[PDB]
Amino acid sequence: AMNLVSEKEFLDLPLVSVAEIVRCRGPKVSVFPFDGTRRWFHLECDFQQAALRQSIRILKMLFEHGIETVISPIFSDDLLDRGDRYIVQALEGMALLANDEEILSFYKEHEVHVLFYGDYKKRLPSTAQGAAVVKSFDDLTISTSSNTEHRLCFGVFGNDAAESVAQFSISWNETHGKPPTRREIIEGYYGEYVDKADMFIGFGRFSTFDFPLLSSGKTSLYFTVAPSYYMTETTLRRILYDHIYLRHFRPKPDYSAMSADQLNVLRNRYRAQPDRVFGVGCVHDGIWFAEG
Amino acid sequence: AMNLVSEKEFLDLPLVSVAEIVRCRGPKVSVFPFDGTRRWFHLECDFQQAALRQSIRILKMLFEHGIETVISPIFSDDLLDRGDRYIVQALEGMALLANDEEILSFYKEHEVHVLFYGDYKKRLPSTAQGAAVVKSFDDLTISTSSNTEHRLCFGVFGNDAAESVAQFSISWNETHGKPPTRREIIEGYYGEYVDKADMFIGFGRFSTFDFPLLSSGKTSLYFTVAPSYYMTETTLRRILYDHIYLRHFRPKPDYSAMSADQLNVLRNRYRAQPDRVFGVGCVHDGIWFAEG
Ligand SMILES: C/C(=C\COP(=O)(O)OP(=O)(O)O)CC[C@@]1(C)[C@@H]2CCCC(C)(C)C2=CC[C@@H]1C
Ligand SMILES: C/C(=C\COP(=O)(O)OP(=O)(O)O)CC[C@@]1(C)[C@@H]2CCCC(C)(C)C2=CC[C@@H]1C
């Protein structure tokens, strides 16, 4: 009923039809970090009110396609560029995610529950503004608590949770008398239970990041050439289709039942190009581009 | 002195020359899981004595190229195919990694310290053979403890350490009085301290796995078309070169200092192919192949 869909049909289907398929076949959890943002700016040219827009646009796209939970890493530890202006403008962006007008409408409009994960509480400056963002985060997380249609997790310094898990477990054992389950551990870092990530949509260099405890061999990885904001309707559907129907294809192969020619034709697909590799690139104006 | 090396020269350099470069520029830690093994068999055709060989060959290659630590996931939780023969032959393979002759020579020959990580102790069957492997693992880890030239970590059910970290931390706090440092936590899971992974060399489908606490945005990802054992001298060097010189290229870009044509030529590199994505593939005889 659902497995008979072709790529062509999938790409021609109405939005609400694709959503129903994703709701049933997944991906249930998708990691979409916002990359190539500054660059994106010195292209097509304000800014924060723009990046914000594109963020809302892409998030809107992802949720309207059936995806329930979107893990979106936004701030990395490399944040300490030392420029207080860089830090001040960063916290300003963090402020919009919880104080902005249209974005709050977005949450209410599409019933989205917002969560924040990372070592931001420990890392954020012990100043007025910084402490305000933390309260804003805590406030929002509870403000949208009533929304159950979609879930959004923002990564603020969420590179490695190891030490965080250690302290969480030590406290949990202290009050409970026994160690927490994996489920409980995940609820402690993300605030709520989240399933492993089904796919990671990156950009440029082949690399994943900022989604602790939610990675597995079953997390399909994708890397667009153009930065995140450049994503189109087509690109997404092709990514979804590959994940749902192609990644884990069934029935599995059966060599002991194939002709000597098929096995022969297959071996060629490999030995044809002996040194074929995906991930190696070339640089143009300081920007890395994947070859092939 | 070291940054002036071209790809061509790098590919023509003697083995010992490449090693000296890797020893200095890295990668210090590389994750190389052995994929496409069964398939590989119904190709070019015994078995265990072969897979073993190729494993030793590739490991030999990696270490002779300057790489100090190789994280190699070998067994995944999907192991419970239920077939006791499948499990019995699996433990047989695990036995070779610690009882084999030539492989032990390999460790002594190239001064390699072997370590095992994963939830194998809890997951391995409470039987005679299984308990023997565990003792073999523990025995080997200490037998090669004197070797300090290279380090090898085998992943046996090392998909997620969360719960493991929880219990480790609860015990550590119990005996020490305070929570363990990230360093200490890593020493507890891998047995010894290991730096983040510098690169992951996979195969086929774009996906990473089985190297907990050692992943970061700086872990260069690579995906060969042919299975692991198919790797050649060329492929490796091209992967190393891309990582060392191309991945994190410097000096970083400067848009506010480029001509309006360069920025224009750059924008084309993206808008030229608007829906370009790496990770989407096609299936041929049940086997997924990356497009592009
Ligand atoms: C520092 C920065 C981009 C740097 O990222 P590089 O990847 O270093 O940019 P390049 O490499 O393309 O030069 C902007 C921060 C951040 C979080 C902003 C913050 C305020 C607007 C908001 C939409 C929230 C937003 C969304 C995402 C973007 C990453
Ligand atoms: C189960 C198996 C391969 C299945 O892996 P798929 O990826 O399912 O194979 P495909 O997908 O290519 O059909 C063999 C196990 C294992 C660990 C063997 C075990 C004994 C020889 C030793 C060299 C140690 C060894 C090395 C690596 C290989 C994964």
Short mmCIF file of all heavy atoms in Angstrom, two decimals, chain B residues 108-157:
data_model
loop_
_atom_site.label_atom_id
_atom_site.label_comp_id
_atom_site.label_asym_id
_atom_site.label_seq_id
_atom_site.Cartn_x
_atom_site.Cartn_y
_atom_site.Cartn_z
N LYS B 108 53.17 -7.56 18.24
CA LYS B 108 54.55 -7.48 18.71
C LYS B 108 55.45 -6.87 17.65
O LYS B 108 56.35 -6.09 17.95
CB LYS B 108 55.05 -8.88 19.08
CG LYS B 108 56.41 -8.89 19.76
CD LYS B 108 56.37 -9.72 21.04
CE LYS B 108 57.69 -9.65 21.79
NZ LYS B 108 58.82 -10.21 21.00
N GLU B 109 55.19 -7.22 16.39
CA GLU B 109 55.95 -6.72 15.26
C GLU B 109 55.83 -5.20 15.11
O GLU B 109 56.82 -4.51 14.88
CB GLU B 109 55.48 -7.40 13.97
CG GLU B 109 56.04 -6.80 12.68
CD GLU B 109 57.54 -6.96 12.57
OE1 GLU B 109 58.02 -8.11 12.54
OE2 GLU B 109 58.24 -5.93 12.49
N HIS B 110 54.61 -4.70 15.25
CA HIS B 110 54.36 -3.27 15.12
C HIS B 110 54.01 -2.60 16.44
O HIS B 110 53.38 -1.54 16.46
CB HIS B 110 53.24 -3.03 14.10
CG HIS B 110 53.63 -3.36 12.69
ND1 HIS B 110 54.51 -2.59 11.97
CD2 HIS B 110 53.27 -4.38 11.89
CE1 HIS B 110 54.68 -3.12 10.78
NE2 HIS B 110 53.94 -4.21 10.70
N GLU B 111 54.44 -3.21 17.55
CA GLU B 111 54.18 -2.67 18.88
C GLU B 111 52.78 -2.08 18.99
O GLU B 111 52.61 -0.87 19.10
CB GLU B 111 55.22 -1.59 19.21
CG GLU B 111 56.65 -2.11 19.27
CD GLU B 111 57.66 -1.01 19.54
OE1 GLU B 111 57.51 -0.32 20.57
OE2 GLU B 111 58.59 -0.84 18.73
N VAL B 112 51.78 -2.95 18.97
CA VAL B 112 50.39 -2.52 19.06
C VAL B 112 49.71 -2.94 20.36
O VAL B 112 49.76 -4.10 20.76
CB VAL B 112 49.56 -3.09 17.88
CG1 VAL B 112 48.13 -2.59 17.95
CG2 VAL B 112 50.20 -2.70 16.56
N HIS B 113 49.09 -1.97 21.03
CA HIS B 113 48.38 -2.23 22.28
C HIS B 113 46.91 -2.41 21.90
O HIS B 113 46.29 -1.50 21.36
CB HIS B 113 48.52 -1.05 23.24
CG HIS B 113 47.80 -1.23 24.54
ND1 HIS B 113 47.75 -0.25 25.50
CD2 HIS B 113 47.11 -2.29 25.04
CE1 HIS B 113 47.05 -0.69 26.54
NE2 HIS B 113 46.66 -1.92 26.28
N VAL B 114 46.36 -3.59 22.20
CA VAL B 114 44.97 -3.87 21.87
C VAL B 114 44.01 -3.64 23.03
O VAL B 114 44.28 -4.03 24.17
CB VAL B 114 44.81 -5.32 21.37
CG1 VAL B 114 43.40 -5.53 20.83
CG2 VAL B 114 45.85 -5.61 20.30
N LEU B 115 42.88 -3.01 22.71
CA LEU B 115 41.85 -2.72 23.69
C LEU B 115 40.50 -3.14 23.11
O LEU B 115 40.33 -3.22 21.90
CB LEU B 115 41.82 -1.22 24.00
CG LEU B 115 43.04 -0.60 24.67
CD1 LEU B 115 42.91 0.92 24.63
CD2 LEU B 115 43.16 -1.09 26.11
N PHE B 116 39.55 -3.40 24.00
CA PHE B 116 38.21 -3.80 23.59
C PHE B 116 37.21 -2.92 24.32
O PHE B 116 37.34 -2.68 25.52
CB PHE B 116 37.96 -5.27 23.94
CG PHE B 116 38.84 -6.22 23.20
CD1 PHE B 116 39.98 -6.74 23.80
CD2 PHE B 116 38.56 -6.58 21.88
CE1 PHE B 116 40.83 -7.59 23.10
CE2 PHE B 116 39.40 -7.44 21.18
CZ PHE B 116 40.54 -7.95 21.79
N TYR B 117 36.22 -2.42 23.59
CA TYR B 117 35.20 -1.58 24.20
C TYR B 117 33.84 -2.06 23.73
O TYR B 117 33.72 -2.72 22.70
CB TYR B 117 35.39 -0.11 23.81
CG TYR B 117 35.19 0.18 22.34
CD1 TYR B 117 33.97 0.67 21.86
CD2 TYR B 117 36.21 -0.03 21.42
CE1 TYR B 117 33.78 0.94 20.51
CE2 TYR B 117 36.03 0.24 20.06
CZ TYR B 117 34.82 0.72 19.62
OH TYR B 117 34.64 0.98 18.28
N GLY B 118 32.81 -1.74 24.51
CA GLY B 118 31.47 -2.15 24.16
C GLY B 118 30.78 -2.81 25.33
O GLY B 118 31.37 -2.95 26.41
N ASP B 119 29.53 -3.21 25.13
CA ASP B 119 28.76 -3.85 26.18
C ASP B 119 28.81 -5.37 26.01
O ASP B 119 27.82 -6.06 26.25
CB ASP B 119 27.32 -3.35 26.14
CG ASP B 119 26.51 -3.77 27.35
OD1 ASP B 119 26.99 -3.55 28.48
OD2 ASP B 119 25.40 -4.31 27.17
N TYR B 120 29.97 -5.87 25.59
CA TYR B 120 30.13 -7.31 25.37
C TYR B 120 30.06 -8.12 26.66
O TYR B 120 29.52 -9.23 26.66
CB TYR B 120 31.44 -7.60 24.64
CG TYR B 120 32.70 -7.09 25.32
CD1 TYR B 120 33.52 -7.96 26.04
CD2 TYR B 120 33.06 -5.75 25.24
CE1 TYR B 120 34.68 -7.50 26.66
CE2 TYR B 120 34.22 -5.28 25.85
CZ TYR B 120 35.03 -6.16 26.56
OH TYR B 120 36.18 -5.71 27.17
N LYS B 121 30.61 -7.59 27.75
CA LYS B 121 30.58 -8.32 29.02
C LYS B 121 29.15 -8.61 29.45
O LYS B 121 28.84 -9.73 29.89
CB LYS B 121 31.30 -7.52 30.11
CG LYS B 121 32.82 -7.58 30.01
CD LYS B 121 33.47 -7.02 31.27
CE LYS B 121 34.98 -7.21 31.24
NZ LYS B 121 35.62 -6.81 32.53
N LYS B 122 28.27 -7.62 29.34
CA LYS B 122 26.88 -7.80 29.72
C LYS B 122 26.10 -8.60 28.67
O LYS B 122 25.29 -9.45 29.02
CB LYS B 122 26.19 -6.44 29.89
CG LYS B 122 26.13 -5.92 31.32
CD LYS B 122 25.18 -4.73 31.41
CE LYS B 122 24.93 -4.30 32.84
NZ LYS B 122 23.90 -3.22 32.91
N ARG B 123 26.36 -8.31 27.40
CA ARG B 123 25.66 -8.97 26.31
C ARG B 123 26.13 -10.37 25.93
O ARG B 123 25.31 -11.21 25.54
CB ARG B 123 25.69 -8.07 25.07
CG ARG B 123 25.07 -6.69 25.31
CD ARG B 123 23.62 -6.80 25.76
NE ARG B 123 22.68 -6.49 24.69
CZ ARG B 123 22.52 -5.27 24.17
NH1 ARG B 123 23.22 -4.25 24.63
NH2 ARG B 123 21.64 -5.08 23.20
N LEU B 124 27.43 -10.64 26.04
CA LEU B 124 27.93 -11.97 25.69
C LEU B 124 27.26 -13.05 26.54
O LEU B 124 27.09 -12.89 27.75
CB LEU B 124 29.45 -12.05 25.87
CG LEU B 124 30.32 -11.33 24.84
CD1 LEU B 124 31.79 -11.66 25.09
CD2 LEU B 124 29.93 -11.76 23.43
N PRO B 125 26.85 -14.16 25.90
CA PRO B 125 26.19 -15.29 26.55
C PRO B 125 26.91 -15.80 27.79
O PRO B 125 28.14 -15.91 27.81
CB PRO B 125 26.14 -16.34 25.44
CG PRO B 125 26.00 -15.51 24.21
CD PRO B 125 27.01 -14.41 24.45
N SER B 126 26.14 -16.11 28.83
CA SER B 126 26.70 -16.62 30.07
C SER B 126 27.06 -18.09 29.90
O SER B 126 26.54 -18.95 30.62
CB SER B 126 25.70 -16.45 31.21
OG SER B 126 25.38 -15.08 31.41
N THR B 127 27.93 -18.38 28.94
CA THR B 127 28.35 -19.75 28.67
C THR B 127 29.86 -19.87 28.84
O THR B 127 30.54 -18.89 29.17
CB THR B 127 27.99 -20.18 27.24
OG1 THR B 127 28.87 -19.53 26.31
CG2 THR B 127 26.55 -19.79 26.92
N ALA B 128 30.39 -21.07 28.61
CA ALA B 128 31.82 -21.32 28.73
C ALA B 128 32.61 -20.51 27.71
O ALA B 128 33.41 -19.64 28.07
CB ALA B 128 32.10 -22.81 28.56
N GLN B 129 32.39 -20.80 26.43
CA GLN B 129 33.08 -20.11 25.34
C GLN B 129 33.05 -18.60 25.49
O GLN B 129 34.09 -17.94 25.45
CB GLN B 129 32.45 -20.50 24.00
CG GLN B 129 32.93 -19.65 22.83
CD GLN B 129 32.28 -20.03 21.51
OE1 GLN B 129 31.05 -20.14 21.42
NE2 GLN B 129 33.09 -20.24 20.49
N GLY B 130 31.85 -18.04 25.67
CA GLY B 130 31.71 -16.61 25.82
C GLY B 130 32.58 -16.03 26.92
O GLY B 130 33.23 -15.00 26.74
N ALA B 131 32.60 -16.70 28.07
CA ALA B 131 33.39 -16.25 29.21
C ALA B 131 34.88 -16.37 28.91
O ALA B 131 35.70 -15.67 29.51
CB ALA B 131 33.04 -17.07 30.44
N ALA B 132 35.23 -17.26 27.98
CA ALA B 132 36.62 -17.47 27.60
C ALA B 132 37.10 -16.28 26.77
O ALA B 132 38.23 -15.81 26.94
CB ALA B 132 36.75 -18.75 26.79
N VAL B 133 36.24 -15.80 25.89
CA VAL B 133 36.56 -14.66 25.04
C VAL B 133 36.81 -13.43 25.91
O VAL B 133 37.75 -12.68 25.69
CB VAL B 133 35.41 -14.36 24.05
CG1 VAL B 133 35.70 -13.08 23.28
CG2 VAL B 133 35.24 -15.52 23.09
N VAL B 134 35.95 -13.24 26.91
CA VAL B 134 36.08 -12.12 27.82
C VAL B 134 37.43 -12.16 28.53
O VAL B 134 38.07 -11.12 28.71
CB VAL B 134 34.96 -12.13 28.89
CG1 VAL B 134 35.16 -10.98 29.86
CG2 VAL B 134 33.61 -12.02 28.21
N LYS B 135 37.85 -13.35 28.94
CA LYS B 135 39.14 -13.50 29.61
C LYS B 135 40.25 -13.29 28.59
O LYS B 135 41.31 -12.76 28.91
CB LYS B 135 39.27 -14.89 30.23
CG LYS B 135 40.56 -15.08 31.02
CD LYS B 135 40.73 -16.51 31.53
CE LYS B 135 39.65 -16.90 32.54
NZ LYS B 135 38.30 -17.06 31.91
N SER B 136 40.01 -13.72 27.36
CA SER B 136 40.98 -13.57 26.28
C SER B 136 41.18 -12.08 26.04
O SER B 136 42.31 -11.60 25.90
CB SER B 136 40.48 -14.24 25.00
OG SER B 136 40.33 -15.64 25.19
N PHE B 137 40.07 -11.34 25.98
CA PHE B 137 40.11 -9.90 25.77
C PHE B 137 40.90 -9.24 26.89
O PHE B 137 41.84 -8.49 26.64
CB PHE B 137 38.69 -9.31 25.75
CG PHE B 137 37.92 -9.61 24.49
CD1 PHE B 137 36.57 -9.30 24.41
CD2 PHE B 137 38.55 -10.16 23.38
CE1 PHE B 137 35.85 -9.54 23.24
CE2 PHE B 137 37.84 -10.40 22.20
CZ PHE B 137 36.49 -10.08 22.13
N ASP B 138 40.51 -9.52 28.13
CA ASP B 138 41.19 -8.95 29.29
C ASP B 138 42.67 -9.31 29.27
O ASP B 138 43.53 -8.48 29.54
CB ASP B 138 40.56 -9.44 30.60
CG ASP B 138 39.11 -8.99 30.76
OD1 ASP B 138 38.81 -7.82 30.44
OD2 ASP B 138 38.28 -9.81 31.21
N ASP B 139 42.96 -10.57 28.94
CA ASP B 139 44.33 -11.04 28.89
C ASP B 139 45.16 -10.31 27.85
O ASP B 139 46.27 -9.86 28.13
CB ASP B 139 44.36 -12.54 28.59
CG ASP B 139 45.77 -13.07 28.41
OD1 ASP B 139 46.58 -12.96 29.35
OD2 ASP B 139 46.08 -13.59 27.31
N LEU B 140 44.62 -10.17 26.64
CA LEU B 140 45.32 -9.50 25.55
C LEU B 140 45.59 -8.03 25.88
O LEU B 140 46.70 -7.54 25.70
CB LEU B 140 44.50 -9.58 24.27
CG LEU B 140 45.17 -9.06 23.00
CD1 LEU B 140 46.38 -9.92 22.67
CD2 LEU B 140 44.18 -9.07 21.85
N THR B 141 44.56 -7.34 26.36
CA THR B 141 44.67 -5.93 26.72
C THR B 141 45.87 -5.66 27.62
O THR B 141 46.51 -4.62 27.52
CB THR B 141 43.39 -5.45 27.44
OG1 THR B 141 42.27 -5.58 26.57
CG2 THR B 141 43.53 -4.00 27.88
N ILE B 142 46.18 -6.62 28.49
CA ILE B 142 47.30 -6.49 29.41
C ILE B 142 48.58 -7.06 28.81
O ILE B 142 49.68 -6.61 29.12
CB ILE B 142 47.01 -7.21 30.75
CG1 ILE B 142 45.79 -6.57 31.41
CG2 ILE B 142 48.22 -7.11 31.67
CD1 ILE B 142 45.40 -7.21 32.72
N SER B 143 48.43 -8.06 27.94
CA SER B 143 49.58 -8.69 27.29
C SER B 143 50.33 -7.69 26.41
O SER B 143 51.56 -7.69 26.37
CB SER B 143 49.12 -9.87 26.42
OG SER B 143 48.44 -10.84 27.20
N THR B 144 49.58 -6.85 25.71
CA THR B 144 50.16 -5.85 24.82
C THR B 144 50.32 -4.50 25.50
O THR B 144 50.71 -3.52 24.87
CB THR B 144 49.28 -5.67 23.57
OG1 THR B 144 47.97 -5.24 23.96
CG2 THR B 144 49.17 -6.98 22.80
N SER B 145 50.01 -4.45 26.79
CA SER B 145 50.10 -3.22 27.57
C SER B 145 51.47 -2.55 27.44
O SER B 145 51.59 -1.33 27.52
CB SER B 145 49.80 -3.51 29.04
OG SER B 145 49.78 -2.31 29.80
N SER B 146 52.51 -3.36 27.24
CA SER B 146 53.87 -2.85 27.11
C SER B 146 54.13 -2.16 25.77
O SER B 146 55.07 -1.38 25.65
CB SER B 146 54.88 -3.98 27.33
OG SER B 146 54.59 -5.08 26.48
N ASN B 147 53.31 -2.46 24.77
CA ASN B 147 53.46 -1.84 23.45
C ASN B 147 52.93 -0.42 23.51
O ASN B 147 51.81 -0.19 23.98
CB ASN B 147 52.69 -2.64 22.39
CG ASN B 147 53.09 -4.10 22.34
OD1 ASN B 147 54.28 -4.42 22.24
ND2 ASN B 147 52.11 -4.98 22.40
N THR B 148 53.72 0.54 23.04
CA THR B 148 53.29 1.94 23.07
C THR B 148 53.40 2.67 21.73
O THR B 148 53.15 3.87 21.66
CB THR B 148 54.11 2.74 24.11
OG1 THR B 148 55.48 2.80 23.71
CG2 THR B 148 54.02 2.09 25.48
N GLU B 149 53.76 1.95 20.68
CA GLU B 149 53.89 2.57 19.37
C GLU B 149 52.52 2.84 18.75
O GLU B 149 52.25 3.94 18.28
CB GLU B 149 54.72 1.68 18.43
CG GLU B 149 55.31 2.43 17.24
CD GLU B 149 56.09 1.52 16.29
OE1 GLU B 149 56.98 0.79 16.77
OE2 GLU B 149 55.81 1.55 15.07
N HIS B 150 51.66 1.82 18.76
CA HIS B 150 50.32 1.96 18.21
C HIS B 150 49.25 1.41 19.14
O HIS B 150 49.52 0.58 20.01
CB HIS B 150 50.23 1.24 16.86
CG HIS B 150 51.05 1.87 15.78
ND1 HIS B 150 50.82 3.16 15.34
CD2 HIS B 150 52.09 1.40 15.05
CE1 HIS B 150 51.69 3.45 14.38
NE2 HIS B 150 52.47 2.40 14.19
N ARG B 151 48.02 1.88 18.96
CA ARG B 151 46.89 1.45 19.78
C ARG B 151 45.74 1.01 18.89
O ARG B 151 45.41 1.67 17.91
CB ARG B 151 46.44 2.60 20.68
CG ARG B 151 45.38 2.23 21.70
CD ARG B 151 44.90 3.48 22.42
NE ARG B 151 46.01 4.25 22.96
CZ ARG B 151 45.93 5.52 23.33
NH1 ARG B 151 44.78 6.17 23.22
NH2 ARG B 151 47.00 6.15 23.80
N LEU B 152 45.12 -0.12 19.24
CA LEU B 152 44.01 -0.65 18.47
C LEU B 152 42.82 -0.97 19.36
O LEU B 152 42.93 -1.72 20.33
CB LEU B 152 44.46 -1.92 17.73
CG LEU B 152 43.41 -2.73 16.97
CD1 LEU B 152 42.64 -1.84 16.01
CD2 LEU B 152 44.11 -3.85 16.22
N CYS B 153 41.67 -0.39 19.03
CA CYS B 153 40.45 -0.59 19.80
C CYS B 153 39.39 -1.32 18.99
O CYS B 153 38.97 -0.84 17.94
CB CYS B 153 39.90 0.75 20.27
SG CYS B 153 41.08 1.78 21.18
N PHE B 154 38.97 -2.48 19.48
CA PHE B 154 37.95 -3.26 18.80
C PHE B 154 36.59 -3.06 19.44
O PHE B 154 36.42 -3.21 20.65
CB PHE B 154 38.31 -4.75 18.83
CG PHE B 154 39.43 -5.12 17.91
CD1 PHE B 154 40.59 -5.70 18.40
CD2 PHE B 154 39.33 -4.88 16.54
CE1 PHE B 154 41.64 -6.04 17.55
CE2 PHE B 154 40.37 -5.22 15.68
CZ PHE B 154 41.53 -5.80 16.19
N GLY B 155 35.61 -2.70 18.61
CA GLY B 155 34.27 -2.47 19.11
C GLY B 155 33.39 -3.71 19.06
O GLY B 155 33.07 -4.21 17.99
N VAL B 156 33.01 -4.19 20.24
CA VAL B 156 32.15 -5.36 20.36
C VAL B 156 30.91 -4.87 21.11
O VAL B 156 30.92 -4.74 22.33
CB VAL B 156 32.83 -6.49 21.16
CG1 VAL B 156 31.96 -7.73 21.16
CG2 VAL B 156 34.19 -6.80 20.56
N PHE B 157 29.85 -4.60 20.35
CA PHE B 157 28.61 -4.09 20.93
C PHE B 157 28.89 -2.72 21.53
O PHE B 157 28.46 -2.42 22.65
CB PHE B 157 28.09 -5.04 22.03
CG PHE B 157 27.83 -6.44 21.55
CD1 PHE B 157 28.53 -7.51 22.08
CD2 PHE B 157 26.87 -6.69 20.57
CE1 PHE B 157 28.29 -8.81 21.65
CE2 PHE B 157 26.62 -7.99 20.13
CZ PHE B 157 27.33 -9.05 20.67
#
